[PDB]
Amino acid sequence: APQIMNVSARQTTSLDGQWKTIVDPFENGRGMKVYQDKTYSDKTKLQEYDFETDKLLFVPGDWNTQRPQLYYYEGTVWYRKHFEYSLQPGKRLFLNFGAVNYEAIVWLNGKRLGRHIGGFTPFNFEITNLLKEGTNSLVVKVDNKRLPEAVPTVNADWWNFGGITRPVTLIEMPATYIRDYYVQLAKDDKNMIEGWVQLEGSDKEQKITLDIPELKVKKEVTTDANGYASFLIKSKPILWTPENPKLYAVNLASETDKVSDEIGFRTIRTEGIKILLNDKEIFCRGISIHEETPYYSGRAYSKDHAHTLLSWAKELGCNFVRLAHYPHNEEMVREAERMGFLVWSEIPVYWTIHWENKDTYQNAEQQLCDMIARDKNRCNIIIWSIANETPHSKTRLTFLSNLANKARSLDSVRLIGAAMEKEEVQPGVLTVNDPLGELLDIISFNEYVGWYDGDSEKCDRVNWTFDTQKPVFISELGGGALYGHHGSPKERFTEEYQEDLYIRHVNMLKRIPGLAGTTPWILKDFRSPRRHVPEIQDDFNRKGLVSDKGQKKKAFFVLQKWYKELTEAYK
Amino acid sequence: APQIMNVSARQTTSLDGQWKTIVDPFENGRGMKVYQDKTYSDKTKLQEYDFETDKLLFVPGDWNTQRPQLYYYEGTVWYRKHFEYSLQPGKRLFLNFGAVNYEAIVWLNGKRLGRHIGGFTPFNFEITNLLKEGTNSLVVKVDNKRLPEAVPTVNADWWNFGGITRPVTLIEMPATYIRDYYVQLAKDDKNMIEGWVQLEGSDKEQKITLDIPELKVKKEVTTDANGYASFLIKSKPILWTPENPKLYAVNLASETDKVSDEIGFRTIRTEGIKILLNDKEIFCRGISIHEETPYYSGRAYSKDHAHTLLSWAKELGCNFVRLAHYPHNEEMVREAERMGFLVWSEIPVYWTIHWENKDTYQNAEQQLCDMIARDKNRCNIIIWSIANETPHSKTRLTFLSNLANKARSLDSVRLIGAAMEKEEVQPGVLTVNDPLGELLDIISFNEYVGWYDGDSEKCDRVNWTFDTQKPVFISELGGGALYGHHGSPKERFTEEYQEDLYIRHVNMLKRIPGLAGTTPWILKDFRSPRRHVPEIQDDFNRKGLVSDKGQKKKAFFVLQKWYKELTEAYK
Amino acid sequence: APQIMNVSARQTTSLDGQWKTIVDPFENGRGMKVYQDKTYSDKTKLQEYDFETDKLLFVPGDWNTQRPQLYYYEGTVWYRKHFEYSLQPGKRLFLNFGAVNYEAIVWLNGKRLGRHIGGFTPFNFEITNLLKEGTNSLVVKVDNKRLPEAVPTVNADWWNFGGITRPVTLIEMPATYIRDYYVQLAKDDKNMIEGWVQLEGSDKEQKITLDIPELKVKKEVTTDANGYASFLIKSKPILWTPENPKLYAVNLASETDKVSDEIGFRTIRTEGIKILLNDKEIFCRGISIHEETPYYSGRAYSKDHAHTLLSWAKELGCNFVRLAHYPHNEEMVREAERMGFLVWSEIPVYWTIHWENKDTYQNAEQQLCDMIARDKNRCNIIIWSIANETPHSKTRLTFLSNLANKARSLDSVRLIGAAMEKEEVQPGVLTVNDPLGELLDIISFNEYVGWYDGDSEKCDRVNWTFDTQKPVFISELGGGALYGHHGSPKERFTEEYQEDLYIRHVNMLKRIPGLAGTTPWILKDFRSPRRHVPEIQDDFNRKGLVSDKGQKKKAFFVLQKWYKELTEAYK
Ligand SMILES: [Cl-]
Ligand SMILES: [Cl-]
Ligand SMILES: [Cl-]
């Protein structure tokens, strides 16, 4: 039931494929005990369901793009899977869900394992003692009803993709296993590897060896009664960069378990309005990215999906991606780490969260913890964001301030951010005035001058100034356009309007003092039921620089041109 | 109207996006002259269509996966596109269709440009003198009715994907332009580049400059009165291989036109049962691949699509891909060329082709000519296949003989293949007995021992022998399975059966004298209305080693293992 | 295989409900022997279909309105039904199809029963000796591909509704049964009932009694060695009329069988330009009706369907319906008989019929024979029509003259009609000029003045003369409109235009010398793939006076008003 670090490198067996399903909008399945998964063999008795003859859905996947009737579906779908597994005595078996949106209730062989809320973070159950011989029955009640107190809350600008959205994996473990570990450079120490290891089980006091063969590193330690051990190691690794995304093969071995990983090393810090990566000043040439596939625009989960998306970001000129608006699948983070993209990773705290609801806060904090705990060894991540645009208020400040201090205590290294409230200093001069800023390492905010705030011309008469000398990071900007839709640059939603907007907006950004990063909104058109223009939007946010079919809009080459200049300037 | 070489390198403007469409099963559109594209604004007259207010389809793409109503649709859809273009006087403008299945009839501003048959080859129309100031109207009537005399014919094991399936591109040329050019190693000569160039237009007698700057080549030639010029260039390029897919930047310039290309150089030849790449004996560790996308299983067209599929082929351990069953989009061939995959490229000729029909022959020969003309500079292509499985009749031999002679006349370097007829030499011993073999450079054939011919263990009881010392290429083998469906290795359509099949089949392949290549069927499950098993096939051929959802079945790793052995053996 | 008379009055058992299906667009089911209906239980064998786990369709019903994917589907669907039946020895069992469009091939328990062409006439197979104990398997291959030589041919102005479109029925008969019978008035004789009865089986020589209690009739005859007997009977029944639709209960009983029927009696003839029902001059206040259902616009088949449509025609003031464009289901003719509607019944012989194809003729003639044989006892039918609008050629006239003489040779009583070619006498004066008229009892034709031929105004300046003194019947007229679409009376497709057209058109009809009937086109909007105006037609012919959703358009009341006047005028 605790998180398991580096699931992919464990003894895994997939449960993915096609599973039997029941759509249950009035939610009578639980009263019916469908989790019992009784095949309706004996028709002399009355039963009013049968997985065995019902329809299939692909797992993993959102359900919305799989059937027209599920396009808008908000409610419960029951999923059922049969599997066999042979577990030698002593060994332990865990069931790992990469993600289920929004609520998951899980049974095995008729017995309730538990419940999970939060649609973008993984969770585990131990089924060691519940596994049986022959056919085991897994039933997952999935629900994506939008709730005011949930995180995200009811309204938000992206499709409500329900389903088992990331792979489902069985993980076999020794009776005492390496559950969690940390291996990174010490804060601001290009010469010191710091880390810890955490065992889980009964034999909690074992010798541990960390092997980094390429660095010729081989340190043995011994865990305490709590199963824990820490270490400092002197060493001078080749430091990871976007241009050379060096990763090291890292091997852990206890007396009962072993696991391999691929980990990179870098320092990251601010220095005035400078972001310094391995002591070198960098610009974050970024683009924002929803977790949505090219071409068919369902929920992304695979390395193929990540590579297509990031290959567009590479052509665009980015060294950086903002993964909005929630923790993405781990394949996305890993692929960016390998290809050489810095990452901004964030939770879906977004607008009118219920700031005074203690359950809401513990949900948000749990997502923050799970996100950081899964990816704390991914050196390409340099910013955690705890919130997008939020309304100013005392209870909002308290909520977000608790999240920020929590993040920094889980990870003393990476920068902490959050969309700050904008203010007008004087006609045509904007700034940022947020008391939360003291707990953040950067000044970051969204702005849509030229799209929501005036026409494209207004970019030419807006300037920015700041009362604190922290690096300025604009995390959203831009405007919409339909690929292949052409007209005057004065006509909204044409490629030509978007192009003119980006030409003027780039000039505005060039005047901003302290600017250290931009992640325009957005890489690729994505589904949103808030966008109603027929034939232009058709329930897509059209602010992509690339169409949902992967076609580069005119504005794409404006930003690419600027990123080339920034690449040369920061070389 | 003639083919244009290297379209992507020209001064191009995309016409892709979403187009207005009219579905017209009874084909009355031509009678009401919908090609006139009259917006129905004056409602005091009777008109019975209106593009302006009708529905959209994405271009490019099959229509089948775009709307449930078009999933099975066979018949006519009308597509309409408005565009503006400012053509400097004297310049010329061409309209390029990457592919349209099956018949395209095209109008511009109400005037018929022409007609094209064949669903997988590009075609052009000059529109220089039909272009208007202001809005231009392009109307395409696309029909995918299956015709007995067509190539392919009514029966085929893949989906009848209709529509404008590859990009639509406007191409601007100077009044006299470089239309076609050939640049490759002379046959079996690592030290001689040979080729030719063909200009189109009035100023046809011109001096041309071919630069390969990295090679320090700068050849100058003058075209004759027909605009043609050939040349021989002494040079020793680094030779393209799957391991080192070296390409050279090649710049052609006329007095008025210029075009750049990326071309590689290699020699390919047979020597007994050996295939020699740059004089080194190689094994073609291949896989077959349909032109169908991952995940949503529409018609593939993009570099994205190609990269995803080829990356699976890379992980499988292949140095070789067979692109079935027709010429694929150009992005697939270019990406295999850049990534290092040898290519087998073929035309949709198979069993029930109308061998006696001269129009069918001319169709098939025209598709062959266009295939070679488009890709003659792609050094990764080493085999042209003119036919899959075909009946053994005098008319078929005559038909395929003429195609084989035609291919060799067009391309003296690459190898020519065609699926040959098998027969039994004695119980448990197979060979091929095909009179066409004299005109082919390899002995190739399909065989499904263990799936169609017996159960998996029949592989253990079958051996092969050949009366001719030519390299043996098995261009299809395998069996079906549904990812996530498990059971006894004796149960068909389980991953276990397919894994057991590949184990024993690999062992059979290891006993075949003269085996030099294999392209199992197939990389990814693909659509086929002949595959009716519910919940297992659901109108997909299931012989992929990868599911249509990117998931590697157990058998994928059996073949991977063997390919890894073959890599080391031939290194 | 012979037709059976009055099927619903027999010992019937329904096979309707939901049947397993396989959509088979490439037609490999036959080669796969899908007609063997082998459940795919033993997965150690390779099979590529499974009825038992496939999807369902409703029978009876077109498939097109049942699934989005089948809306446009033209091709083969396999239907399977399981059933049990205990046939006591000596008794006989027939399988009856009300209609299947277009071609049906039928198997029982793996054995081919036969094949049927023509989508609108019933057909039978005797299954007495092929029935087995336990489960019986009925497999039906249904195909609606449009064929150039078919009847109807490739394009017609109504939807290509495929499937088992009318009920399927098992019929148990005695060893010798009453197969067919005729009971009507002799030609032009209110005082003589003529008839015959036809037995089937070995015991052909039998005594038979024709009981008509309400007439105190009780005639006994004895059949010859061929099972036939004719008879004449003096009687003075009450004569059926639209106003008093009097039907008599009729009972036939043989030594071993008996059947009951409901039959009316009437005389029909022409006298100059007059149509005389029961020697009384009448006007046919008609409306044309396609066999398509209210609200969901599927293929109609039930008494419910017929009653709804006929109730609309009742409200319109009609005493007469044209059932287009083919023989309708039997419920529709019987419900028209009971409610008091004269009927025009026709076969789908239209413009582009292959006049020179002997198979085409045989097909049309079988459909005509089957039409008349089924309904020869329905006294409300007064007109058989052998063609709609057909081109004037010598082969067309030979074709239709044979049908007309075949029709008259089968029915000495009812009138024969056909759409005759119009002609312009002078500017503003039309007539009919057709050599076929010499063989028709009426001058019938279609005319669309004010819709296809001019604006509504043109009706005010068009007049009609006729070279022969036969009753003039306008079998189509009208124009389109969308219910709830309003505008100027000059704007096409508004209710107002259609209202103004009917006002002026009716005033034209009032000027026509010899006019004796009108069946405007049409009662209810109906599906047609020829009708492309978005948001107005959306693949519906909009010429209905009632929307497809049962809503009465303004023009409905214009025609109702005229029909009121005609009702009073013909008292
Ligand atoms: Cl937008
Ligand atoms: Cl298969
Ligand atoms: Cl209409």
Using H for helix, E for strand and C for coil, what is the string for B115-151?
Answer: EEECCCCCEEEECCCCCCCCCEEEEEEEECCCCCCCC
**Distance, CA A524 to ligand 1 centroid (Å)?**
11
The number of beta carbons lying within 10 Å of the beta carbon of residue C136 is 17
SS3 C95: strand
Q: Which burial class, exposed, middle or buried, applies to C560 when counting CB atoms under 10 A from its CB (0-12, 13-18, 19+)?
A: middle
Cα dihedral C290, C296, C301, C306 sign: negative
Looking only at the bridges linking them, the beta strands covering A207-212 and A248-253 are antiparallel
First to last CA, chain C: 47
All residues of chain B having their beta carbon less than 8 Å from the beta carbon of residue C535 are 53
Distance of alpha carbon C397 from alpha carbon C402, whole angstroms: 8
Assess contact for C287 and C484: CB atoms under 8 A: no
Of B70, B452, B533, the CB nearest to C50: B533
- Extended strands (E) in C25-91: 55-59, 76-83
Resolution in A: 2.0
Which residues place a Cβ less than 5 A from the ion ligand 1? Answer: A 480, 541-542
The H or E element containing residue B97 is strand B92-97
All residues of chain B having their beta carbon less than 8 Å from the beta carbon of residue A18 are 482, 484, 535
Tokens 């978007």 appear where?
Answer: A498
The number of beta carbons lying within 10 Å of the beta carbon of residue A481 is 28
**Distance, CA C547 to ligand 3 centroid (Å)?**
12
All residues of chain B having their beta carbon less than 8 Å from the beta carbon of residue A298 are 295
User: What is residue C208's DSSP assignment?
Assistant: E
All residues of chain A having their beta carbon less than 8 Å from the beta carbon of residue B56 are 535
- Is C312 flagged in the annotation as binding? no
- Alpha helices, DSSP H, located in A329-462: 330-339, 358-375, 394-410
Q: Give Cα C460 distance to the centre of its chain.
A: 35
Distance of alpha carbon C8 from alpha carbon C329, whole angstroms: 12
Closest B-chain CA to C69: B69
Minimal Cα–Cα distance from A83 to chain B, Å?
8
Complete DSSP assignment for A298-319: -B--SHHHHHHHHHHHHHHT-S
Complete DSSP assignment for B290-323: ESB-TTT--B--SHHHHHHHHHHHHHHT-SEEEE
Assess contact for B92 and B124: CB atoms under 8 A: no
Assess contact for B258 and B251: CB atoms under 8 A: yes
Q: Which two tokens stand for residue A168?
A: 């489902």
Q: What is the dihedral of CA C311, C312, C313, C315, to 10 degrees?
A: 90
C-alpha to C-alpha distances, A11 to A262, A332, B333, nearest whole angstrom: 17, 21, 38
Q: Answer whether B28 sits within 8 Å of C155, measured CB to CB.
A: yes
C-alpha to C-alpha distances, B126 to A300, B86, B182, B449, nearest whole angstrom: 42, 15, 23, 51
User: Strand order in B207-212's β-sheet?
Assistant: B217-222, B207-212, B248-253, B258-263
Quick one: which ligand is closest to C540's CA?
3
**Helix%, strand%, coil% for chain B, nearest 5:** 20, 30, 45
Distance of alpha carbon B344 from alpha carbon C521, whole angstroms: 60
Helices and strands in chain C: count of H runs, count of E runs:
7, 33
**Distance, CA C450 to ligand 3 centroid (Å)?**
13
All residues of chain C having their beta carbon less than 8 Å from the beta carbon of residue B72 are 23, 25, 69-70, 72-73, 75
Closest B-chain CA to A54: B535
Assess contact for B316 and B360: CB atoms under 8 A: no
C-alpha to C-alpha distances, B118 to A511, B140, B167, nearest whole angstrom: 56, 15, 16
To probe the interface with C, which of B26, B47, B537 has the most C CB atoms within 10 Å? B26
The H or E element containing residue B174 is none
Closest C-chain CA to B29: C530
Q: What is the dihedral of CA C295, C299, C301, C307, to 10 degrees?
A: 30
Alpha-carbon radius of gyration of chain A: 25
Q: Answer whether B45 sits within 8 Å of C492, measured CB to CB.
A: yes
Looking only at the bridges linking them, the beta strands covering B429-432 and B463-464 are parallel
Q: Answer whether B311 sits within 8 Å of A308, measured CB to CB.
A: no
The number of beta carbons lying within 10 Å of the beta carbon of residue B423 is 11
Distance of alpha carbon A417 from alpha carbon C171, whole angstroms: 80
Greatest CA separation for chain B? 80
All residues of chain A having their beta carbon less than 8 Å from the beta carbon of residue B485 are 17
Minimal Cα–Cα distance from B510 to chain C, Å?
26
Looking only at the bridges linking them, the beta strands covering B515-518 and B472-476 are parallel
The number of beta carbons lying within 10 Å of the beta carbon of residue A226 is 10
**Distance, CA B498 to ligand 1 centroid (Å)?**
47
**Distance, CA A66 to ligand 1 centroid (Å)?**
24
C-alpha to C-alpha distances, A24 to A31, A139, B93, nearest whole angstrom: 11, 14, 57
Distance of alpha carbon B557 from alpha carbon B502, whole angstroms: 10
Residues belonging to chain A = 571
Query: Which among A349, A371, A372, A370 has a CA at the least distance from the CA of A361?
Result: A349
The H or E element containing residue B102 is none
- Is A389 flagged in the annotation as binding? yes
All residues of chain B having their beta carbon less than 8 Å from the beta carbon of residue A549 are 58, 61
Closest C-chain CA to B540: C48
**Distance, CA A308 to ligand 2 centroid (Å)?**
29
Distance of alpha carbon B409 from alpha carbon B425, whole angstroms: 35
Q: Which two tokens stand for residue B302?
A: 């993009």
CA angle B467, B473, B474 (to 5 degrees): 105
User: Strand order in B168-173's β-sheet?
Assistant: B11-14, B168-173, B92-97, B123-126
Distance of alpha carbon A108 from alpha carbon A93, whole angstroms: 13
- Is A357 flagged in the annotation as binding? no
Q: Which two tokens stand for residue B205?
A: 């007698």
Query: Which among B129, B46, B136 has a CA at the least distance from the CA of B91?
Result: B129
Cα dihedral C163, C169, C170, C172 sign: negative
The H or E element containing residue B362 is helix B358-375
To probe the interface with B, which of A296, A488, A539, A554 has the most B CB atoms within 10 Å? A296
Assess contact for A183 and A195: CB atoms under 8 A: yes
Query: Which among B144, B140, B147, B146 has a CA at the least distance from the CA of B123?
Result: B140
- Is C451 flagged in the annotation as binding? no
Phi/psi-derived region of residue B194, left when phi > 0, alpha when psi is between -120 and 50, beta in every other case: beta
Of B15, B58, B549, the CB nearest to A58: B549
Distance of alpha carbon C417 from alpha carbon C471, whole angstroms: 11
At how many degrees (to 10) do helices C495-509 and C554-569 cross? 20
Ramachandran angles phi, psi of C49, nearest 5°:
-160, 160
Assess contact for C438 and C401: CB atoms under 8 A: no
At how many degrees (to 10) do helices B495-510 and B554-570 cross? 20
C-alpha to C-alpha distances, C202 to C177, C196, C227, C229, C256, nearest whole angstrom: 10, 19, 9, 16, 12
Of A17, A304, A482, the CB nearest to B294: A304
Q: Which two tokens stand for residue A137?
A: 């029955």
Distance of alpha carbon C65 from alpha carbon C62, whole angstroms: 7
Quick one: which ligand is closest to C497's CA?
3
Assess contact for B526 and B290: CB atoms under 8 A: yes
**Distance, CA A24 to ligand 2 centroid (Å)?**
33
Q: Which two tokens stand for residue A278?
A: 């391995």
To probe the interface with A, which of B12, B18, B331, B339 has the most A CB atoms within 10 Å? B18
Complete DSSP assignment for A113-177: EEEEE-TTS-EEEE-TTT--SS-EEEEEEEE----TTSSS-S--SS----EE-S-EEEEEE-SSE
Q: Which two tokens stand for residue C92?
A: 């006989």
User: What is residue C326's DSSP assignment?
Assistant: S
**Distance, CA A536 to ligand 1 centroid (Å)?**
9
Q: Give Cα A3 distance to the centre of its chain.
A: 16
Query: Which among C479, C482, C461, C487 has a CA at the least distance from the CA of C558?
Result: C479
